[PDB]
């Protein structure tokens with residue numbers, strides 16, 4: 001209905017039909033078209049034709065370049081103001097702040113950012129009205145999970161960015177089939193704008209529309225809305241990924257008895273023909289993708305990848321923790337990727353891949369720090385800043401948080417069960433981060449409650465994945481600091497509660513450190529495929545092997561228990577050393593952090609594990 005002619009957007013639809021949409025989808029699309037005032041509405045179909053045409057259009061406009069060396073690969077270079085997540089501009093809206101974060105004693109929380117509904121309405125009104133003028137609003141129906149799976153969750157993302165459309169086609173299952181699967185069901189409402197209505201009010205930098213000053217990534221869990229303004233960077237604009245499948249989903253999971261986690265899922269097969277699945281939570285840019293598609297150095301071992309970033313898991317009636325990967329692609333850090341470090345990623349990204357903020361070679365290929373491939377004499381390099389570049393120059397040729405965005409189905413070791421709606425049974429959970437000192441290569445938690453404490457106590461050097469600079473060691477509990485959808489204390493309680501579930505077969509919990517350094521700042525452990533030697537030890541421990549010795553922080557490998565054949569130059573004593581002074585300091589730091597940041601919401605069990613660790617260290 002309407003008394004005039006501005007409410008019904010039918011005449012502005014350039015693909016699809018508002019009449020063909022499910023009723024509630026139409027209302028969502030049209031309501032936001034009324035607000036944002038796009039010139040056109042394009043309902044995505046997910047087809048190869050749509051995708052190729054959109055890419056060519058972006059190429060026309062100078063928004064992306066085709067990489068002529070490869071099969072259907074593309075390179076986007078962004079405004080340098082829009083390169084990573086911004087935690088301080090990422091918020092969750094609830095009636096009560098304590099539902100979203102524990103109230104920190106110190107007054108500033110490091111476990112999320114809350115915004116009142118009043119303040120968010122004002123922020124929304126200062127951003128979205130008219131924001132799509134002169135642009136197309138693309139409507140992206142997407143599934144987090146295989147099309148038609150009983151455990152998939154569907155969303156609709158509205159965006160004015162073709163780059164977002166193309167990247168969502170890779171990272172989710174997208175298009176008409178999803179609308180058909182959705183029918184009259186519920187869907188997560190996702191609204192995104194780059195925040196640059198036409199005619200442009202401000203200079204366009206590097207043909208990359210964005211609004212840094214007004215960037216705001218908001219989540220409204222009771223209304224089932226995600227609303228993101230001003231950034232095109234995938235972590236901020238691919239709304240099915242961090243926003244939905246971690247922040248919204250972790251709160252749903254709390255309410256419904258499951259888990260949504262920042263974890264890879266991999267399957268590993270040993271030389272005796274046994275296969276086990278493991279999950280691992282490491283912070284952004286701290287080794288998940290490389291572990292998930294590892295090429296093991298140990299003969300007779302094989303790793304297969306289920307997912308590299310997000311896991312949705314629950315204990316089933318048989319007691320097994322079963323996990324699914326709700327994503328359809330990998331959005332991986334590019335620098336460091338080489339045939340030696342991640343040969344499976346190199347094979348995956350050679351076709352149908354979008355690269356962002358990497359360098360370009362004159363024969364139409366890609367380049368980045370650590371790529372470890374010599375170029376022919378005469379071949380030149382254009383940096384991610386679109387300037388000619390030479391290896392002798394002061395700055396990197398690729399941004400440190402540059403990315404590939406690639407279909408998971410193309411991974412040569414994609415696991416045969418990666419789309420099974422039954423999920424895969426997790427037998428070990430691994431925590432870890434970047435710790436240049438003090439923390440040994442691997443240890444095993446003493447119990448479930450100890451393992452939840454180990455997750456809670458995680459710390460890691462800052463990376464380029466968000467706004468934190470330098471290499472300051474930060475708390476990042478469960479690798480979820482940027483991603484909790486609700487109060488972290490409550491999340492710890494939820495984890496603890498799993499132990500008391502009927503027939504629960506609780507996975508073993510481990511903590512790793514690939515990143516300990518010697519006195520000269522060189523890594524003590526080579527990592528990458530050599531991490532298979534650590535996974536071997538974990539595998540044996542899951543099977544019940546007596547290959548561990550007790551220490552104050554947990555179980556570690558016995559002398560000679562790790563296979564170090566071919567690594568005679570590793571300094572094992574240094575790499576496994578546990579210093580009373582370091583750990584006295586560590587436990588004091590963890591105590592103060594949990595007291596300040598979790599406070600009244602810290603479960604008794606976790607405080608008890610803290611007291612126990614302090615006491616074990618005191619007996620050293």
Ligand SMILES: Nc1nc2c(ncn2[C@@H]2O[C@H](COP(=O)(O)OP(=O)(O)O)[C@@H](O)[C@H]2O)c(=O)[nH]1
Pocket residue numbers: 282283284285286287288289290291308332333334335336337341514515523526527528531
């Ligand atoms: N030294 C070392 N670096 C690693 C290892 N695994 C990954 N990296 C590097 O760390 C960065 C992030 O790796 P990635 O696996 O993409 O981490 P993710 O963001 O957690 O998925 C890349 O530059 C990798 O080359 C490892 O075992 N050792």
Ligand SMILES: [Mn+2]
Pocket residue numbers: 262283284309
């Ligand atoms: Mn991640």
Ligand SMILES: [Mn+2]
Pocket residue numbers: 285288289308309331332333
């Ligand atoms: Mn990754």
Ligand code: NA
Pocket residue numbers: 062063064076077078079206207208
């Ligand atoms: Na650009």
